[PDB]
Every structure is written in structure tokens, then in C-alpha cells.
Scaffold this active site. Structure first.
Site, mmCIF file in Angstrom:
data_model
loop_
_atom_site.group_PDB
_atom_site.id
_atom_site.type_symbol
_atom_site.label_atom_id
_atom_site.label_comp_id
_atom_site.label_asym_id
_atom_site.label_seq_id
_atom_site.Cartn_x
_atom_site.Cartn_y
_atom_site.Cartn_z
ATOM 1 N N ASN A 20 -7.908 7.904 -6.265
ATOM 2 C CA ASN A 20 -8.735 6.836 -6.881
ATOM 3 C C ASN A 20 -9.458 7.400 -8.116
ATOM 4 O OD1 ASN A 20 -8.047 4.844 -4.894
ATOM 5 N ND2 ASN A 20 -9.384 5.921 -3.452
ATOM 6 N N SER B 68 -12.100 9.847 -4.891
ATOM 7 C CA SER B 68 -11.662 9.689 -3.483
ATOM 8 C C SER B 68 -10.122 9.571 -3.479
ATOM 9 C CB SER B 68 -12.311 8.520 -2.815
ATOM 10 O OG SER B 68 -11.852 7.315 -3.390
ATOM 11 N N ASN C 264 -9.252 4.987 2.525
ATOM 12 C CA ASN C 264 -9.894 5.833 1.483
ATOM 13 C C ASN C 264 -10.900 6.800 2.116
ATOM 14 O OD1 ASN C 264 -12.828 4.920 0.991
ATOM 15 N ND2 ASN C 264 -11.735 2.965 0.862
ATOM 16 N N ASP D 267 -12.579 7.329 -8.706
ATOM 17 C CA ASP D 267 -13.917 7.877 -8.328
ATOM 18 C C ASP D 267 -13.788 9.273 -7.707
ATOM 19 O OD1 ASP D 267 -12.984 7.231 -5.767
ATOM 20 O OD2 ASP D 267 -14.879 6.278 -5.142
ATOM 21 N N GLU E 20 0.838 -1.232 0.000
ATOM 22 C CA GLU E 20 0.000 0.000 0.000
ATOM 23 C C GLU E 20 0.866 1.273 0.000
ATOM 24 O OE1 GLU E 20 -2.911 0.013 -0.852
ATOM 25 O OE2 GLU E 20 -3.993 -1.723 -0.007
ATOM 26 N N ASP F 149 -6.736 7.694 -1.185
ATOM 27 C CA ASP F 149 -6.194 6.737 -0.187
ATOM 28 C C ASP F 149 -5.061 7.416 0.604
ATOM 29 O OD1 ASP F 149 -7.887 4.706 -1.277
ATOM 30 O OD2 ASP F 149 -6.223 3.657 -2.225
#
Ligand SMILES: [Rh+]
Ligand SMILES: [Rh+]
Ligand SMILES: [Rh+]
Ligand SMILES: [Rh+]
Length: 129
Positions: A46, A50, A59, A48, A35, A52
Site C-alpha cells: 500500500n 502497509s 492489510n 502508506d 483481490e 495486503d
């Protein structure tokens, strides 16, 4: 902060992640490796809209407020910037809620694709815990 492998294992263990909902410490270290590469400051956008945040790439769609993720939730009741601190407390406590949400560590797509079904014990090999 960029953690050492054993340093992060030790902080995660102190914060109660070892066998949390049955996930051995190696799972959490593996997840953090793929990660964030153990970097608390890691951010990634992301598709969409959003973002992380932090060592476990938590998120803004569900878990934290970053002030720019429309139609989203803040289920950890935190600003997403708290997930970037040298102190992993907020990431760990939020991770415990995420992993409890019904899909276990499959919530972390990198865990499912890179850690699940592998020798995750290797991630804590040699550490004093
Ligand atoms: Rh701590
Ligand atoms: Rh253990
Ligand atoms: Rh243990
Ligand atoms: Rh020990």
C-alpha cells in the site's frame, strides 16, 4: 495455493462465510477474484507502507503483524504470513472480524468497486455447494 472458483466457494462455505453478516458466498468469491485471483500467496504494498496479504488482501495497517508496519494494529492477533497459507482458516476468521467492523464488505475497496451492485451469484454458478 491457487484455488479453483468452485473449490474456493466450497472452502469459504465450509468456514461459514455464506451469508456472514448478510453477504452471500458470491460476494466473497468475487472479492477474492479481484483481490488475489484466488492465490493464497498474493502480497501487494500500500502507499502508506502497509501490505495486503492472502486471498482477501488483509492489510497490516489494522489486522496482522508483518514486523514492518509502524504505528499499526494486529486486531486478528496473527502474523501476516499466516494469511498466505494453503489453509484459508486464518484469512476467513480475520475476514469475519473485518466485515463486522462497521463498514461491511466496503472494507474491501475491490469489493466496492468491482462486486457491489453486480450479479455476484455468477461467481458460484455451476459449483456443487
Ligand atoms: Rh478448511
Ligand atoms: Rh447461501
Ligand atoms: Rh447456502
Ligand atoms: Rh449443498
Amino acid at each position: 495455493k491457487v484455488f479453483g472458483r468452485c473449490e474456493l466457494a466450497a472452502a469459504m462455505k465450509r468456514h461459514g462465510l455464506d451469508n456472514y453478516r448478510g453477504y452471500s458466498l458470491g460476494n466473497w468469491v468475487c472479492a477474492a477474484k479481484f483481490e488475489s485471483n484466488f492465490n493464497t500467496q498474493a502480497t501487494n504494498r500500500n502507499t502508506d507502507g502497509s501490505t495486503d496479504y492472502g486471498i482477501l488482501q488483509i492489510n497490516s495497517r489494522w489486522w496482522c503483524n508483518d514486523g514492518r508496519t509502524p504505528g499499526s494494529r494486529n486486531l486478528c492477533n496473527i502474523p501476516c504470513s499466516a494469511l498466505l497459507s494453503s489453509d484459508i482458516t486464518a484469512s476467513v476468521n480475520c475476514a469475519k472480524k473485518i466485515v463486522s467492523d462497521g463498514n461491511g464488505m466496503n472494507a474491501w475497496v475491490a469489493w466496492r468497486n468491482r462486486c457491489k451492485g453486480t450479479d455476484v451469484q455468477a461467481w458460484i454458478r455451476g459449483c456443487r455447494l
